[PDB]
Design a protein around this ligand. Sequence first.
Ligand SMILES: *[C@@H]1O[C@H](CO)[C@@H](O[C@@H]2O[C@H](CO)[C@@H](O)[C@H](O)[C@H]2NC(C)=O)[C@H](O)[C@H]1NC(C)=O
Ligand SMILES: *[C@@H]1O[C@H](CO)[C@@H](O[C@@H]2O[C@H](CO)[C@@H](O)[C@H](O)[C@H]2NC(C)=O)[C@H](O)[C@H]1NC(C)=O
Ligand code: NAG
Ligand code: NAG
Ligand code: NAG
Ligand code: NAG
Ligand code: NAG
Lengths: 381, 383
Amino acid sequence: QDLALSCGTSEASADQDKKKWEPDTKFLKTGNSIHATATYQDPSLLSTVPYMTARIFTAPATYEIPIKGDKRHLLRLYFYPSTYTGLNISNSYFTVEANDVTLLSNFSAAITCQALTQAYLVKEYSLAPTDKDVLSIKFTPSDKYRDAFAFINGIEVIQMPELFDTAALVGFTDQTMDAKTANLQSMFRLNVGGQDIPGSQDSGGLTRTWYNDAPYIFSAGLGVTLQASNNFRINYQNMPVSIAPADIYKTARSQGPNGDINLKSNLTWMFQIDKNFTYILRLHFCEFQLSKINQKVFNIYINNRTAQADTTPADIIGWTGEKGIPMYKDYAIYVDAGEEITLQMTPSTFGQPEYYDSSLNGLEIFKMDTMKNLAGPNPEP
Amino acid sequence: DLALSCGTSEASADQDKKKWEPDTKFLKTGNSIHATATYQDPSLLSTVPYMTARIFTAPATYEIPIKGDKRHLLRLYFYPSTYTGLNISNSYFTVEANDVTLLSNFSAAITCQALTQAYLVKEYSLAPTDKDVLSIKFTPSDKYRDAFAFINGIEVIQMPELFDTAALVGFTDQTMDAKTANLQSMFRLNVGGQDIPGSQDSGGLTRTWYNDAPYIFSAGLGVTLQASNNFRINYQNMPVSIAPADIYKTARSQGPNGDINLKSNLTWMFQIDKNFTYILRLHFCEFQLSKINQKVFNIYINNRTAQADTTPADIIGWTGEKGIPMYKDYAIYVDANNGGEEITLQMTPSTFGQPEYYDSSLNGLEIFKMDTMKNLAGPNPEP
Ligand SMILES: *[C@@H]1O[C@H](CO)[C@@H](O[C@@H]2O[C@H](CO)[C@@H](O)[C@H](O)[C@H]2NC(C)=O)[C@H](O)[C@H]1NC(C)=O
Ligand SMILES: *[C@@H]1O[C@H](CO)[C@@H](O[C@@H]2O[C@H](CO)[C@@H](O)[C@H](O)[C@H]2NC(C)=O)[C@H](O)[C@H]1NC(C)=O
Ligand SMILES: *[C@@H]1O[C@H](CO)[C@@H](O)[C@H](O)[C@H]1NC(C)=O
Ligand SMILES: *[C@@H]1O[C@H](CO)[C@@H](O)[C@H](O)[C@H]1NC(C)=O
Ligand SMILES: *[C@@H]1O[C@H](CO)[C@@H](O)[C@H](O)[C@H]1NC(C)=O
Ligand SMILES: *[C@@H]1O[C@H](CO)[C@@H](O)[C@H](O)[C@H]1NC(C)=O
Ligand SMILES: *[C@@H]1O[C@H](CO)[C@@H](O)[C@H](O)[C@H]1NC(C)=O
């Protein structure tokens, strides 16, 4: 049932990553709308597909997408804020609903793009099984602003495995958060210590993009990036390959070879998020240089609270049992009053490890829905 | 989509601008052997992927990340030549792909010798298995101690669900479902037209469509037809992945003499594997006539009825307009009392409804083997 719809097109198209797109026409169910073309092509666009073409809604409109009601789905909304049909994009405020889940509300693509110094947006969601064979995507211009309108450049609907289970609540002992039936928004997805991974190289056929993590490091010093040897094989064992592609686990960011400096600092990532949501941090690990337990043992903190410390710090081989075996660990945190998530790691002195270091291979951050809502406020410029 | 040239360590490209990459990072099992052939047959269209092979002396498995809900095209390339320190005629092995048996006791040397070709490409369409890994397992025969397995190239390509139902030959108004079937591509023909390389195939599937003349059994090659310059094939709602436009721009017909056409069947014959159900996909497009009841013809498969009597074939009658392409699927179980090892396709004009012409035509032809008990493996041919 997978779809890649470029809205506002009339023939097939393909982007710079060879992904094939088709017109959205046969899936638009209610309302009126016209095709529109952007008046300015930003040089930061990796492709004109699907960004340069849009469908404009000056009144509510609904898509109906056939899906398997028993399955989880990825939903991607592509937005390219430009001048369409002579309208000022600053008047665009609208709501997007996927069945009973609110994804966006008073959403301003123009404001959101300006705050991120970015010409385009991709909003990605993982929707729990609906038990309905139709996914209704409804666009509603705001009733609070006069001249408000909605727009969309591309829509992707991708069936995906149930890759979410439970997550350990940070700072609490033996408290878990269940995400098995949660609706999630992908906030960030990083190949830590490695290059961007395009969707064409993603596993599971999910065409996820994994970005390099360097822009999110806020500690002084970016550590030391590592790469597995030539033809090193990642031994997934019973972990589904859909969790993350092999190239995620073939690279990592570490603190470095000097244990004394490592003991005096935290490797620190920071991320801007929306307040009043619980977030899941999925940390991907794979040891490809060391071989034994108690060689590399490190503490991990999330928002200044403990996620592996004290007498149970992180040790990849301790968790996996053998070098080359990949793994992930899910942690949960409720964020209220700030609006950023900080991830920190530093060596542990517990148990006298051979080295004083820390490492991480990949990172994903998901927002969990609260009463069927994932929509946050627009950022400040 | 993946094109693995087995036994290589660097990326390569063939004669049709297809890029290939080494297979090593997808191989799960160790202690394989890689070898380069010591003789390059001049009939090879390219040294890629044929001239390099991987050899297995024990069961070996490739693990290829896939999307579980997708149907996939799977191609296996074999070049039974001389490799240093190996006897290729000793090779008998099994190939399975996610619980589907593709080959068993397979001898690439014997198969190549019977076909009088130096290389082999086996192509399969694998139904969704709802797993994110395609496990391709090569098992040397446990009947022969010195038997080993080998492979030169592997292709895995996502493909749409291009198969639905098929009309059962010889029975009226009875259908066969192939939506979830595993298929082997047996023949793929551009009827009346030139070879179409994979680079010119539709839907990114890089299928090759071959001219059909070698398979004509009837006395007389009929008359080939070609559409006018820039003739527009109007697919409408038929997916373009079904077949490229040039398939529908050529056809083979019986000819302009309706009196002679009524006295004979235009006949193709194909060698296949006994004890299997086969689907014949007949591709049609009328690019000369414009009205219903102008060309009306009977079609027979294995001397049995597939559109005859009061429901014969009429392209415009099916399509409604010239220039629109289409296909019809017919299914037949071939055993000892149904042709043995052969499929025969026959067409002749119909006398029902008094058509304006007495002719028949066909634009393309694909033959697929359906799996039985998750098995597609047949015996080796006879020298
Ligand atoms: C719709 O979104 C706009 C933009 O975020 C909101 O307007 C801003 O409100 C914040 C906080 O009240 C101010 O700091 C900004 O200066 C405002 N910007 C603009 C351009 O107005 C607005 O409140 C939202 N409307 C609703 C109904 O939620
Ligand atoms: C494996 O395949 C070989 C090759 O087809 C089989 O050997 C042939 O068997 C046929 C039928 O009896 C004979 O006519 C040929 O002379 C044989 N050729 C050779 C080279 O032996 C063999 O029987 C198959 N083995 C199994 C276990 O199925
Ligand atoms: C765009 O809309 C905003 C709405 O606040 C307005 O201030 C601005 O003048 C508009 N720009 C143009 C070019 O009309
Ligand atoms: C965030 O939570 C505070 C505390 O209850 C509440 O006052 C505020 O309205 C919330 N903001 C949003 C956007 O939900
Ligand atoms: C690491 O971060 C935690 C939480 O922010 C802090 O308590 C600790 O002192 C830091 N450790 C080092 C070595 O900076
Ligand atoms: C074909 O089917 C018949 C009938 O069951 C069986 O006896 C025979 O062994 C089969 N032959 C082959 C080559 O599969
Ligand atoms: C055409 O083929 C059918 C099926 O084999 C046969 O019954 C018929 O006699 C043939 N017609 C001619 C004219 O040979």
